[PDB]
Design a binder for this molecule. Structure first.
Ligand SMILES: CNC(=O)c1cc(Oc2ccc(NC(=O)Nc3cc(C(C)(C)C)nn3-c3ccc4ncccc4c3)c(F)c2)ccn1
Length: 258
């Protein structure tokens, strides 16, 4: 019942200024409803759809349908008007997108991640560039496969593997060890991204030197205007030992009872 017919969608523009891969603005003509359309090798492409069929949460991206074993193949997703969170923060009116709205943003992502934690999913690339902003500041967690779509300024090699270095937990850099706790660390950086209205992490520091810095216990400074308690949440997310890091259940609770 997920199967749609290609011709029921009118295809329009490339999303994200054309830096988010083969994903388009489209319209489900029957409902006059704007949708996002991922277009197409096929076995990875089909496995994405399968995963997304088992994802239902208000702060996670929502499959609407697929067009299958015929090219072009589509994955059709509910449309998020305002696009990615990174660019959103960077270009927003900060009286409208004020500290309350920043908090509401973080609280939404932690709910999404609480849900992924319960489902034993590991995201592996959490960051503001992978979050979507819709009407009334609704935020949804997504995965655009950006490691194949971006450059060495964001994704590059550490010890012979490719990483989004400045979002990557130390044990993942050192052992290719990925877990829900490596996603917590990433969440830490994403909280810093939100609080800075989309500043790049470790400003001015080359991706080359990040691991050694962390290892000597350096972490990023408290952003301007960020409450001490939210900063300590970042610092909790960035414990060297993944065991010492809070669960997403724990983080969500902290926002709830602030
Ligand atoms: C203006 N509006 C817009 O720009 C706009 C654009 C928009 O486009 C898309 C957004 C999200 C996706 N897809 C995903 O998010 N995939 C995903 C989620 C997860 C989770 C659920 C596990 C996080 N795992 N994987 C996921 C799973 C397997 C994968 N295998 C290979 C590659 C990637 C993969 C990703 C997409 F295809 C298109 C939607 C709404 N608005």
């Amino acid at each position: 019942k997920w199967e749609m017919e290609r011709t029921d969608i009118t295809m329009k523009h490339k999303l994200g200024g054309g830096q988010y891969g083969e994903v388009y603005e489209g319209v489900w003509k029957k409902y006059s409803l704007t949708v996002a359309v991922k277009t197409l090798e096929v076995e990875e492409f089909l496995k994405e759809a399968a995963v997304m069929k088992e994802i239902k949460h208000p702060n996670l991206v929502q499959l609407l349908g697929v067009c299958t074993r015929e090219p072009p193949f589509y994955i059709i997703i509910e449309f998020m008007t305002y696009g990615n969170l990174l660019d959103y923060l960077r270009e927003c009116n900060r009286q409208e997108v004020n500290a309350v709205v920043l908090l509401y943003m973080a609280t939404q992502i932690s709910s999404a991640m609480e849900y992924l934690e319960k489902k034993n999913f590991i995201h592996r690339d959490l960051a503001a560039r992978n979050c979507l902003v819709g009407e009334n500041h609704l935020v949804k967690v997504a995965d655009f496969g950006l490691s194949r779509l971006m450059t060495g300024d964001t994704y590059t090699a550490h010890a012979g593997a490719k990483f989004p270095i400045k979002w990557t937990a130390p044990e993942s850099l050192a052992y290719n060890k990925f877990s829900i706790k490596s996603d917590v660390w990433a969440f830490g950086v994403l909280l810093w991204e939100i609080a800075t209205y989309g500043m790049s992490p470790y400003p001015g520091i080359d991706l080359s030197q990040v691991y050694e810095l962390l290892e000597k216990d350096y972490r990023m400074e408290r952003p301007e205007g960020c409450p001490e308690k939210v900063y300590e949440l970042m610092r909790a997310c960035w414990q060297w030992n993944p065991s010492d890091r809070p669960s997403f259940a724990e983080i969500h609770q902290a926002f709830e009872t602030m």
